[PDB]
Design a protein around this nucleic acid. Structure first.
Ligand SMILES: [Mg+2]
Ligand SMILES: [Mg+2]
Ligand SMILES: [Mg+2]
Ligand SMILES: [Mg+2]
Ligand SMILES: [Mg+2]
Ligand SMILES: [Mg+2]
Ligand SMILES: [Mg+2]
Ligand SMILES: [Mg+2]
Ligand SMILES: [Mg+2]
Ligand SMILES: [Mg+2]
Ligand SMILES: [Mg+2]
Ligand SMILES: [Mg+2]
Ligand SMILES: [Mg+2]
Ligand SMILES: [Mg+2]
Ligand SMILES: [Mg+2]
Ligand SMILES: [Mg+2]
Ligand SMILES: [Mg+2]
Ligand SMILES: [Mg+2]
Ligand SMILES: [Mg+2]
Ligand SMILES: [Mg+2]
Ligand SMILES: [Mg+2]
Lengths: 170, 181, 57, 244
RNA sequence: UUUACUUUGAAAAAAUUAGAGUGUUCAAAGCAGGCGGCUCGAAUAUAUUAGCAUGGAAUAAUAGAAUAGG
RNA sequence: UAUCUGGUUGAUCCUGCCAGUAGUCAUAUGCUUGUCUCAAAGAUUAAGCCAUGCAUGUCUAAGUAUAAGCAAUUUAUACAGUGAAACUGCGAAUGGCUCAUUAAAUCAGUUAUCGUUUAUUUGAUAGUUCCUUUACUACAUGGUAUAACUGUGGUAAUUCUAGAGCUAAUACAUGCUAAUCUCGACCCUUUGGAAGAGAUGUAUUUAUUAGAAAUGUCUUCGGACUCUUUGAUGAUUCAUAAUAACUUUUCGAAUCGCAUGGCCUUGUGCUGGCGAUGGUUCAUUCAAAUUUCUGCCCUAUCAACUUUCGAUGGUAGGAUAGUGGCCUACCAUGGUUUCAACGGGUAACGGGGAAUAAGGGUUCGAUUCCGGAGAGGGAGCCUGAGAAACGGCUACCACAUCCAAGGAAGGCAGCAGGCGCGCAAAUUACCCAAUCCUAAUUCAGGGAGGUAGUGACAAUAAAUAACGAUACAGGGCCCA
């Protein structure tokens, strides 16, 4: 049913084009995978060639990266807070790329504690708002993967101008 | 399917076939050379027209042009080889002076008549079509065979022909058998 | 050639539906389940009009 | 079509093969292999229409699967194997070695060579790139990947490959004054020396070539194959030496 | 100065067309190799426009911190 | 509109006029039709409808035979020859036919993929030693399993199948087995030994990182002493490498034929040859998909069109093999047009080409080659590298086959052959043996193709008679 063909669209001049041919398989589309937070449910999709794609119907955990510290930890997902394209996805807690999400701070906190031994000092100094988030127990993160394609919820924590911008939008 | 193969018409109907001049010219030509019909004269006229149009187009071009030199030399060579064009006239200008009568002369029928193997043009046609004439070692049963200068001296009676040294034909041996009986 | 008469229009009713749909969009300026599922005349009326008014006249 | 084609009709076949238009309806479609379809000569054509050892198909097949034919020192059994430019075909039983080189007319010529010359070939360096694990390699015109190449080898250079081991013995850089062979176009088969390489960024590079007769002609760079330096080709040349 | 325009060079499948050779018994055709190095042989050509490279003095547009000011 | 004839009055001339007079090459049609070479077969704008038959299957020594199959044997001790059936692998997405629809669409030439998939072919490419429950299969793991087969059954009927019982893998699912490389103290001065400090695959996802005056001294006269250290494109966040984690997450040979060589501490010990089939990644090859610029018949008595239900653009997401309003959400109001947009007609598939013409031009091109679309009309899909497939599947519309009335089975614009009229036209022919294509494969298959047959399609050559003698008569022919 879903097709990506451009023939059905009107011409640039506005002319209504006629059907050149029947719909073709190589120009197909598939239903969206509205990934949601919950017990992991993934099913594979046989795609063009022998390749495969992974469909995240549900996922509750993902690998997130502290870029400033250059570390990566697996963390549970709390919930979607802000998505630039659709607020309805935020309302339904739908997971997609670029979505601003809340993640648990326990592993990053414990790693910080082990490495720096503080609840050296100059290096242990970190931006204020993310420290406030550590105090709260949840961190704002941006999903950098595409769960409907690779089946993963992997991303990076917000910081600096990024964090200030999304805080203003929140 | 298999690739197409080319074919072409060897003659063309004249522009006005009811000109009295054309009718009498054709009468003279057919009678002189024993031609079966007008399609032969049309064929020869078509060939001559093609040759003379080519020669005119060559004479248009500047002298020493590569195309003119090469293809004109080829045309003179072919015409002299067929014997139509004499050795002393190897120029395109004499090609434009050519005629149907000369190509008719180079026909095998006319040559079997001329060399003395036959007493008439029609007798020559009979002998050729009848399988009594051989050019060199090959039997030719086609009056329209165009003979070359070298092939001219090899026209003779075939080895298999009764006139060439073989046994008498069916009529002769039948009459001999009846006479003996 | 889009809307030519066909030999048997009934046999290709689906094709006709497309043509009417194309005609609708093309001339719009002038006007202004799942099969692979597991379980499934005028002159006379004018003439009378002229007569009756001629009577009522 | 809904997939790859598998049939080749005679009129659509390459002209240089010289296939009779009335012999049949189809022509031998070259199978996938080292060379392009249009720039390859399938073994069936070589054995039947050129060498005349075979009269027709299954006799070519039988010749092949007795393992008498070797292409670049390896036995091949596919009738439509796409042998191409500078391929060495060895027939041990008859004691013949051939190198596939176009003549001046532009068709592959039956050129007999000695065993010593048959021991090697030349490949135009189509690509030079680092592979996995930081391993350099060169891709030649016949699809041979040779790892660990000399650093001096660049694209458009010509590498002398030993057939037995498949390693580079020597190389020739692409520079003016080098002896060069044309492998396409209307000048296909001519031989000359480089004069200048006209460079156009974002476009096809053009090369000027001067023959021994001093006639000059220009050709696209993709159509250029270095074979040696002037007066010293690294291979034996057909009759005519790529003149006219 | 740039463009238009023009010269040449690549390119434009094969088949078809024109052309060279060849005693298919002739012809329509098909066809590329012969003698024991012989300087033997399709030598080949053909396409309006668009794109690419290239030589251009005229012609038609296009430009100037042109002959400016103190 | 030349040439030829005739009429224009009481006649003859010279003008002028009028009538007839011309190669066409397309359709239909009539008559005749001996030979050689040869070559084609459309048409009711009816892409209208089809009985019957065939047109795609395939096995090497080299995936799986206890067929209660056949034949063998030194008469068989895991098997071994040949091999039905079935599983497995591959192909069926090629070929052939037709021109319905289609007017910047297709198509022609010319570009790009630094914008993406790619079975197959060809060339390269993967020793990770170790890491407690070793309580240990690698001299090799399971049914988490079945066909063919045995046996019992249902239906009027079909290439319909139910229950129960068996048994295999290159089917399915699992899972292992004393290495190499840096320096190198110390001896020794080389063919050197090595105490010891160190390092260790792939596949997916994200983040980050790299990817730029030694002009001296000695020496044996050589050479040594210190330093260098990625490549490519016109152009990149390219190639490649590194760090940290991640994965219902892969791969890293539990496969097969032939043959029996070499070491010994003599063990059914160790090692070892020529091939086939598989497998990660890269390149190559056959391809596929988008894509850049120029070029389409008639119509202005079609002048404004597109945008509410995406039209132009921006951002983000989703989807795609991938770019992209391809779709979603929100934003702006954009886009084309008298240089003809938009709409309408087209007995419109496009081109290489064909006819005519002195040149310019005009017409045709379903039709032997390239490309595009389709399989009665729409819609949607499984499989597979590749299909929106139709001699694959599912629904709807129109037709239409069998029936025991409960159901079942359909797509000849494929090769022959019919209907569409009550008026008409190739053989329901033979061969896979010349060409090539498909398969596990020399061998099997191929209405692709070829052979022959059949209305003078279009073309070439060319018989139906030639040579004499004798007799009789004087008239024969041409102009006017
Ligand atoms: Mg006789
Ligand atoms: Mg096809
Ligand atoms: Mg480039
Ligand atoms: Mg047995
Ligand atoms: Mg199967
Ligand atoms: Mg229209
Ligand atoms: Mg295969
Ligand atoms: Mg069972
Ligand atoms: Mg929208
Ligand atoms: Mg049409
Ligand atoms: Mg056509
Ligand atoms: Mg199709
Ligand atoms: Mg039909
Ligand atoms: Mg398959
Ligand atoms: Mg379909
Ligand atoms: Mg069918
Ligand atoms: Mg089909
Ligand atoms: Mg038929
Ligand atoms: Mg056929
Ligand atoms: Mg009828
Ligand atoms: Mg096998």
């Amino acid at each position: 049913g879903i097709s990506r063909d451009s023939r059905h669209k009107r011409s640039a001049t506005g002319a209504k084009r006629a059907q050149f041919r029947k719909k073709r398989k190589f120009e197909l589309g598939r239903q969206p995978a509205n990934t949601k937070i919950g017990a992991k449910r993934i099913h594979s999709v046989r795609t063009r060639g022998g390749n495969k794609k992974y469909r995240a119907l549900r996922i509750e955990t993902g690998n997130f990266s502290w870029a400033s510290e250059g570390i990566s930890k697996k963390t549970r997902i709390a919930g979607v807070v802000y998505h630039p394209s659709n607020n309805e996805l935020v309302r339904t807690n739908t997971l997609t790329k670029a979505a601003i999400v809340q993640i648990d701070a326990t592993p990053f906190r414990q790693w910080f504690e082990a490495h720096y031994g503080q609840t050296r000092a100059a290096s242990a100094k970190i931006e204020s708002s993310v420290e406030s988030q550590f105090s709260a127990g949840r961190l704002y993160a941006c999903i950098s993967s595409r769960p409907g394609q690779s089946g993963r919820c992997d991303g990076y924590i917000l910081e600096g101008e990024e964090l200030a911008f999304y805080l203003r939008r929140l | 399917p298999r690739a197409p193969r080319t074919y072409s018409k060897t003659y063309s109907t004249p522009k006005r076939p009811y000109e009295s001049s054309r009718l009498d010219a054709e009468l003279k030509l057919a009678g002189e050379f024993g031609l079966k019909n007008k399609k032969e004269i049309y064929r020869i006229s078509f060939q001559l027209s093609k040759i003379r149009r080519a020669a005119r187009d060559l004479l248009t071009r500047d002298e020493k042009d590569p195309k003119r030199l090469f293809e004109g030399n080829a045309l003179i060579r072919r015409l002299v080889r067929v014997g139509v064009l004499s050795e002393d006239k190897k120029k395109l200008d004499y090609v434009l002076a050519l005629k149907v009568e000369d190509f008719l002369e180079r026909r095998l029928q006319t040559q079997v008549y001329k060399l003395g193997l036959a007493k008439s043009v029609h007798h020559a046609r009979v002998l050729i079509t009848q399988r009594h004439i051989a050019v060199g070692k090959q039997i030719v049963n086609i009056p329209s065979f165009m003979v070359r200068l070298d092939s001219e001296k090899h026209i003779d009676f075939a080895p298999t022909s009764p006139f060439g040294g073989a046994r008498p034909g069916r009529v002769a041996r039948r009459n001999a058998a009846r006479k003996a009986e | 050639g889009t809307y030519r008469k066909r030999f048997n229009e009934k046999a290709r009713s689906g094709h006709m539906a497309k043509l009417k749909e194309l005609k609708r969009i093309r001339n719009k300026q002038f006007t202004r389940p799942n099969a692979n599922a597991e379980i499934l005349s005028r002159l006379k009326k004018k003439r009378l009009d002229k007569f009756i008014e001629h009577q009522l006249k | 079509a809904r997939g790859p084609k598998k049939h080749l009709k005679r009129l659509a076949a390459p002209h240089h093969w010289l296939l009779d238009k009335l012999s049949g309806c189809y022509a031998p479609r070259p199978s996938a292999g080292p060379h392009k379809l249009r720039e390859s000569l399938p073994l069936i054509v070589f054995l039947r229409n050129r060498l005349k050892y075979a009269l027709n198909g299954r006799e070519v097949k039988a010749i092949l699967m007795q393992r008498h034919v070797k292409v670049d020192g390896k036995v091949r059994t596919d009738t439509t194997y796409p042998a191409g430019f500078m391929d060495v075909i060895t027939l041990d039983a008859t004691n013949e070695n051939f190198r596939l080189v176009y003549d001046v007319k532009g068709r592959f010529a039956v050129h007999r060579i000695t065993d010593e010359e048959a021991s090697y070939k030349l490949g135009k360096v189509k690509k030079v790139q680092l592979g996995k694990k930081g391993v350099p390699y060169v891709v030649t015109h016949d699809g041979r990947t040779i790892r660990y190449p000399d650093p001096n080898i660049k694209v458009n250079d010509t590498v002398k490959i030993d057939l037995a081991s498949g390693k580079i013995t020597d190389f020739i850089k692409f520079d003016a004054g080098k002896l060069v062979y044309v492998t396409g176009g209307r000048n296909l088969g001519r031989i000359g020396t480089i004069v200048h390489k006209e460079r156009h960024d974002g476009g096809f590079d053009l090369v000027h070539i001067k023959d021994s007769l001093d006639n000059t002609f220009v050709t696209r760079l993709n159509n250029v194959f270095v074979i040696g330096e002037q007066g010293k080709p690294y291979i034996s040349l057909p009759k005519g030496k790529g003149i006219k």
